[PDB]
Design a protein around this nucleic acid. Structure first.
Ligand SMILES: [Mg+2]
Ligand SMILES: [Mg+2]
Ligand SMILES: [Mg+2]
Ligand SMILES: [Mg+2]
Ligand SMILES: [Mg+2]
Ligand SMILES: [Mg+2]
Ligand SMILES: [Mg+2]
Ligand SMILES: [Mg+2]
Ligand SMILES: [Mg+2]
Ligand SMILES: [Mg+2]
Ligand SMILES: [Mg+2]
Ligand SMILES: [Mg+2]
Ligand SMILES: [Mg+2]
Ligand SMILES: [Mg+2]
Ligand SMILES: [Mg+2]
Ligand SMILES: [Mg+2]
Ligand SMILES: [Mg+2]
Ligand SMILES: [Mg+2]
Ligand SMILES: [Mg+2]
Ligand SMILES: [Mg+2]
Ligand SMILES: [Mg+2]
Ligand SMILES: [Mg+2]
Ligand SMILES: [Mg+2]
Ligand SMILES: [Mg+2]
Ligand SMILES: [Mg+2]
Ligand SMILES: [Mg+2]
Ligand SMILES: [Mg+2]
Ligand SMILES: [Mg+2]
Ligand SMILES: [Mg+2]
Ligand SMILES: [Mg+2]
Ligand SMILES: [Mg+2]
Ligand SMILES: [Mg+2]
Ligand SMILES: [Mg+2]
Ligand SMILES: [Mg+2]
Ligand SMILES: [Mg+2]
Ligand SMILES: [Mg+2]
Ligand SMILES: [Mg+2]
Ligand SMILES: [Mg+2]
Ligand SMILES: [Mg+2]
Ligand SMILES: [Mg+2]
Ligand SMILES: [Mg+2]
Ligand SMILES: [Mg+2]
Ligand SMILES: [Mg+2]
Ligand SMILES: [Mg+2]
Ligand SMILES: [Mg+2]
Lengths: 65, 273
RNA sequence: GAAGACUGGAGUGCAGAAGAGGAGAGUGGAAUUCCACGUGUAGCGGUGAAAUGCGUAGAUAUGUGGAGGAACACCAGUGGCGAAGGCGACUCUCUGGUCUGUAACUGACGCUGAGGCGCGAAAGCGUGGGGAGCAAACAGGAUUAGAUACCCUGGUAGUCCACGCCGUAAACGAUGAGUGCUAAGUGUUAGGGGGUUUCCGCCCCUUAGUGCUGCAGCUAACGCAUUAAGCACUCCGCCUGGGGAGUACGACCGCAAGGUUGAAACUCAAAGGAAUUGACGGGGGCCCGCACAAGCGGUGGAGCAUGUGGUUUAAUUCGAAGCAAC
């Protein structure tokens, strides 16, 4: 459970923070559902856009392995 | 675009034409005009060898640059004009030297651009490059067959060819007719499709308008006499009472392949149309 | 009706929030297809079975590179936005609406709305680009008594884009718009206030959406029930037994297919909604029986007795017809 972002108070999810985003993707680069990481709805949407942006600039793998 | 006419008369009922929207000027470069004279299909001996020709509006040849052998000199596009001697339009180009030449106006060419020829030129519309410098997959036109001769292959309005692959001294190219052809890598070509793409939609609408371009009426062989055509003769309307439709000189005309059966360039053609 | 006054309805200002709302211009990665070149050999594909089909001019498989079109895996959720149709890759530009708080401002400026004007899935039409997959018509191979179908192999218009038409749908919540009043319980989306608390977190109050369960009340019943099908007020659209029939005639619109408006003669004594009790299903669960399994031994094979059919005869007397006649 517990929203990771709300618990730590971070209110801006950025696509450059490639080390943070890798927590919420699978080992293959797929985004994980909010019913597994437990993050709240308002922040899952922000997370999805940031991952899609940084996927484009080779910071994250589209399909990995 | 294409301009339609209201049916004010029966001869203008279905006639269409071009609006000439892309043509900039109307006065040719007087230093690049040469005279022509109609031949009407007449021969060296004065005989008629090719029929249905002769008797149109008089024209004047203007020399086109197919070789494109001025290398390293930037050239600015000045005007886009009308050439009666060919289907595509032409563009007047004055290089930085002060030398003026005509080329075939490609699609997307407009006044004010700059073009180059050589080995340092970019892959841009209007540039001329040797085929060994053109990457595979690009669309080219004005292909030439022998080095240093001048473009011959793809020149008509709205036509294009594509580079398929390189295999050494030669290059595979898919011509506009749809055959993969193999030509030398030292020949030149121009990037881009040819300009006047809408030329094939024009409806003549009149017999006189067809006569303006220098065409004479075509008589079907079925209405001739037995000594005039293999189809001639017969009481009433008659069918083709033969094994095959025939040309005026014999030699069946429907399906019969006429390419020479022992041609030298057969090895340089991969697949036919 | 006329002249004044007010702020709660309505709107503006100020401060915040969320969103696949729209149009244009670019860009990205998986995958099917095609092309060029490495390696390799006789198969590949398909079905309930097979054939058509592709393959020794060397495929299917595999590695590298290129071309082009279309749709956007996970996120994804009785989640969100829009008046309805509808809108899911990313970035930028131009844009419409909505919700919460404040009480700064105007001071009834409001609701509904026949004729009118716009938007309106998919198919379809006109001019022109584009065409990778899929696929009406169609061709071939199957199936069957026949198969103008379902199945297999291909395949054109079409599906895509620009502009102009069309004006329809189970266009559905089968439920017109506005406003007020009438028990509760519990999820979720976007906000606001307060208690506890170093934050974190838990609880209570509240506004606008989106679901489930339920009292009064309503309903023929099913069921609806603060997102009413309850109790009331204002304006609009529509109905008056079934067929003929959304037909004919007239009119308006359309390039065309057609669309909107729209009867009568004649004929029937019914058409219809919901729920009940059976019966049935090439619907689903559970139990039983020499019903299958585990056995032992027969029949169908050969020779005869014997009953039936068939057939032959003047007669071959009549009745029995899967199980349940022989
Ligand atoms: Mg001729
Ligand atoms: Mg011309
Ligand atoms: Mg005659
Ligand atoms: Mg003869
Ligand atoms: Mg004859
Ligand atoms: Mg006759
Ligand atoms: Mg107000
Ligand atoms: Mg949007
Ligand atoms: Mg292969
Ligand atoms: Mg709405
Ligand atoms: Mg006042
Ligand atoms: Mg209204
Ligand atoms: Mg109206
Ligand atoms: Mg459509
Ligand atoms: Mg197919
Ligand atoms: Mg309707
Ligand atoms: Mg619908
Ligand atoms: Mg609703
Ligand atoms: Mg209706
Ligand atoms: Mg109702
Ligand atoms: Mg009502
Ligand atoms: Mg109401
Ligand atoms: Mg209300
Ligand atoms: Mg109400
Ligand atoms: Mg709620
Ligand atoms: Mg509450
Ligand atoms: Mg809302
Ligand atoms: Mg509610
Ligand atoms: Mg009532
Ligand atoms: Mg209920
Ligand atoms: Mg109330
Ligand atoms: Mg509802
Ligand atoms: Mg009712
Ligand atoms: Mg009525
Ligand atoms: Mg009636
Ligand atoms: Mg009647
Ligand atoms: Mg019933
Ligand atoms: Mg047994
Ligand atoms: Mg045994
Ligand atoms: Mg046994
Ligand atoms: Mg046994
Ligand atoms: Mg025995
Ligand atoms: Mg008997
Ligand atoms: Mg009997
Ligand atoms: Mg029976």
């Amino acid at each position: 459970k517990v929203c990771y972002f709300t618990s730590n108070g971070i209110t801006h999810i950025d696509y450059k923070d490639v080390e943070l985003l890798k927590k919420f993707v699978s080992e293959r680069g797929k985004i994980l559902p909010r019913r597994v990481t437990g993050t709240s709805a308002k922040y899952q949407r922000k997370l999805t856009v940031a991952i899609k942006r940084s996927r484009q600039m080779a910071l994250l793998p589209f399909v990995a392995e | 675009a294409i301009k339609k006419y209201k049916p004010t008369t029966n001869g203008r009922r279905h006639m269409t034409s071009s609006d000439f929207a892309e043509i900039t000027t109307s006065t040719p470069e007087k230093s690049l005009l040469r005279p022509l004279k109609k031949k009407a299909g007449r021969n060296n001996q004065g005989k008629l060898t090719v029929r249905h020709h002769g008797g149109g509006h008089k024209r004047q040849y203007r020399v086109i640059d197919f070789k494109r052998n001025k290398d390293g000199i930037p050239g600015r596009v000045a005007t886009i004009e009308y050439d009666p001697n060919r289907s595509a339009n032409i563009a007047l180009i004055n290089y930085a030297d002060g030398e003026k030449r005509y080329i075939i106006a490609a699609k997307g060419l407009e006044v004010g651009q700059t073009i180059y020829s050589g080995a340092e030129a970019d892959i841009k519309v209007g540039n001329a490059l040797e085929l060994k410098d053109i990457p595979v997959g690009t669309v080219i036109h004005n292909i030439e067959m022998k080095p240093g001769k001048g473009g011959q292959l793809v020149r008509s309005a709205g036509t294009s060819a594509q580079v398929l692959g390189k295999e050494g001294k030669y290059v595979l190219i898919r011509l506009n007719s749809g055959e993969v052809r193999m030509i030398l890598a030292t020949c030149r070509a121009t990037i881009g499709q040819v300009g006047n793409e809408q030329h094939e939609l024009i409806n003549i609408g009149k017999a006189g308008r067809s006569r303006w371009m220098g065409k004479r009426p075509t008589v079907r062989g079925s209405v001739m006499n037995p000594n005039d055509h293999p189809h001639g003769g017969g009481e009433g309307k008659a069918p083709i009472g033969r094994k095959s439709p025939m040309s005026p000189w014999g030699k069946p005309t429907l399906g019969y392949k006429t390419r020479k059966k022992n041609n030298n360039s057969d090895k340089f053609i991969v697949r036919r149309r």
